[PDB]
Amino acid sequence: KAPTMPKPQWHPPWKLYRVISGHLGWVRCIAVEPGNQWFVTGSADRTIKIWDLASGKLKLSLTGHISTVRGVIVSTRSPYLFSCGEDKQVKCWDLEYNKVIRHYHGHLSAVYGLDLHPTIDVLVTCSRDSTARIWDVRTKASVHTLSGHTNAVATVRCQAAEPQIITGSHDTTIRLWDLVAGKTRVTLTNHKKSVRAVVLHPRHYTFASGSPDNIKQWKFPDGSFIQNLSGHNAIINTLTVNSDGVLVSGADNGTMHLWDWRTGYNFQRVHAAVQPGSLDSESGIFACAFDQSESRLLTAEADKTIKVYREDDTATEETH
Template identity: 65%
Template sequence: MAEKEDQLDSQDVLSLVSNSLRTTKALFGPEFASAPTFEKTLGQSTKRSFKETFEYGNVIEDFNYRRKNAAGKEKDLEYAPSNALAVATNPNAPSEQALVRQQGSFQGNKAVVGQVPMQSLEKINNVPSAAHRLAQESQASLVKRTLAEQIRPQWHPPWKLMRVISGHLGWVRCVDVEPGNEWFCTGAGDRTIKIWDLASGTLKLTLTGHIAGVRGLAVSPRHPYLFSCGEDKMVKCWDLETNKVIRHYHGHLSGVYALSLHPTLDVLITAGRDAVARVWDMRTRQNVHVLAGHKSTVSSLVSQEFDPQVVTGSMDSTVRLWDLAAGKTMTTLTHHKKTVRALALHPQEFTFASGSSDNIKHWKFPEGAFMGNFEGHNAIVNTLSINPDNTMFSGADNGSMCFWDWKSGHKYQELQATVQPGSLDSEAGIFASTFDKTGLRLITCEADKSIKIYKQDEDATPETHPNIPWTPSNMRRRY
C-alpha cells in the first residue's frame, strides 16, 4: 500500500509540473517561438547572462568607456549595464523575463540578454545607474594632460669682436656703463678705477684710492656719483665733478665683492666675504639693514624697484630674495648645487637668471618660481648679462662665452676668448660683463688684463649665418 501511495504522489508531482510547463508555454510561446527544450535553455542562459551583467557590468562598462575616449570616439554612453543593487533592492524592479522582453529577441534556442537602455533604468529606479555615475566621475581624470610646448628660438645675429682695450695692470674684475651711454668704468686688481670713452675706447680718467683690488662699481643714474668697493673692506662714493672721494661706508668685516644701487631709493647695497649684505643710506652713511642668512661669501647682488627688491647669490649655493622694508628673507632658492657667482635681471620682464658651474637657471619673480635651465655651458660661470633683445650672455673661468635665446633657452652661439699676446692660455677667464644702454655692445672684463667690446654682425642673415641647430628636448619645459 505504501509503495502505491508513493507512486501516486510522484505521478501527481509530474502531472503538476507538466501542467505548469504547458501553461507557461501557452502564455509565452507565441512571443518567443520556443523550441522543445525552451525551459532548460531559458533558465541556464538567463542565469549566466544576468550574473555577468550584475556582477561585472560596471567594470566592463568602465573599460569600454575608457577605450572609447582613448580612441577619440564618442564619449557619451548610450547604454549601460543594469544596476544589480538597484534591481535587488527596488520592489518595483522588473523580473528576469520582463528584462528579457525589454531587450527583445531570441536567437534560435538562446536568449540574448545584454544591455538595457539607461533611460529606462533611470525611470525604473529613479536614480542614475552605477555605471553612469562612475563614467561621469571618471571623466575628469581621463582628460589628457597638456604637455608644455617647446618654444622655437628666435634667430639672433652672431656676435663678433669689435675692439680690444688695454691699460690695466691686473685682472679686470668689474665694469659699469654711464646712464648717458657715453663712457664706462672698470675696476681691476691693480687697485685703480679707469674711465673709458665708449665710442673710441680711449682712456679718459684714472681714479686711485683703494689699497686692494676693486671688485664692484656702480654709476648712479640720479646723482653725479660713482660707487666702488674692493677687497680692502672699503666702500667709497666718488664725486664725478671733482673726481674725489666724498663718502666712506664703514662696517664690512672682510672684502666687499658685490655692489648695487637701488633704482629709485637713495640706498646702496653691498655684500662680501662676511656672508651678509648691508644696506646703506647713501647720504647719512648709516647702515640701515644687515641682511644676514647666508652661510658663506655673498658673491653676487642685484636690486630692483619692486618686491623682492634685493636678490643675493652666495657661495653656499643658495639664492635669497629679500624684503628690503623688513630686512628679512622672503624666499630661499636651493636648486643650485654649486657656488652662485652671477645674477642678472631681465631689463623688461619680471624675471632673472642665476649662474653656477652646474647650470644657469631661469627664475620668475616675485615668489622665485623656477622656469627652466640653460644647459650647455660646462664651466664655472662668473658673469651673466641680458639685453632687451632677449639675448643672454654667459662668461666663464676658462674663457668660454655662450649667447642664449632668453625665451627658449637655446644656445645659439659659442665663442672662445682670445688672450692677448704675451699672456698665458690660462689667463682667458672672463670675470665681468655688461651690455651698454642700447644693448648693441657687449663689454667683457678678462684675466689677460684687457677689456673687449663685441657687437652683432650687421650683415648677417639667417641664410648666411645660421645659428646652432635647435633640437626640441623634453628635458626643458616651461612652467
C-alpha cells in the first residue's frame, strides 16, 4: 500500500570476512588503484601505508607528515598519488621512487579533503579556513581560489561533465562551482546539520548529498531535489555508491547503513563490533570504498581498523 514499495531491486547483503588493524593512530581515508592491486590509506600515525587487497599483507609504509593525514587519493592517468592533512601540506607521493616531488603549499589553514579530475591535470582541495582551491599539476600554482563559504569545507568532488566542482561545507550548505571563471554556479541550502559527504555515481546523473538529518539527493543540471531518504539520524562522515545500485553510508557511532538506488530502501542495518583494545563506544566510520570490480567493500573506522566485506550467496533476504 506504500508508494514505491513493490519495486526495489534485490541486492545481496554484505558480510565480514577479514579485518586489517596495524595502525597506531586514527586511520582516516581510503583510496584504491584502478588496477585492482592494492589500496592506500593514511592515519594519525603520520605514516601512509598501502595494503594488498587479496592477501592482506602490508606492502609498504612511508612517513613524512608533521600532522595527521586527512585525505589520500591515487591518480589514473599518472603513476603517482596525492596525500593531504592538517600539516598545511599537500604532498605528491611519487610511486616510482616512493618520495615527494612537488610539496604543494599556500593554504592559510589546515587541509581536509582533495579530489582529482578524471581527464585533465588539475586538482581540487577543500581546506579549513573558508576556501576550496585549484592546484595545477606541472605548475603547483593556485589557479583559482573558491571563496564563498563562511566555515570549513568537509569534502569535494569534481568530474568532467558540467558542472565541475561540488563543495559541501560546515556552514550547512553545498555549492556547485564554475571551474573556468572561479565564481559559483549554484548554492544549495538544506541540512540543518552540516553536509560532510558528496559522491559521484559515476554512471548517470543525480548525485547524492550527506548530512546527519534527512540525507538527500540532487541533480547535475540546474539543481533538483529528487528524493530524501529515511531516518538515518546518526552524524555521518562518508558516502560511497556502486554502479549496480547499492549505496553505503558510514557514520560516527559505528552504525553503517546500506541503501538502494532504485527506491531508497534500507536493507541490512549492520553494526560493527570492536576489536579487543577498543572500548564500548569508539567505533566511527571515517572511510569507505568499494573495489574496482565493486565485489568487495572496505571501511576504515575510528578503532584504527579496516573491515572488509564481501557478498553473501544466499537467497532468503527478501524485501517486506
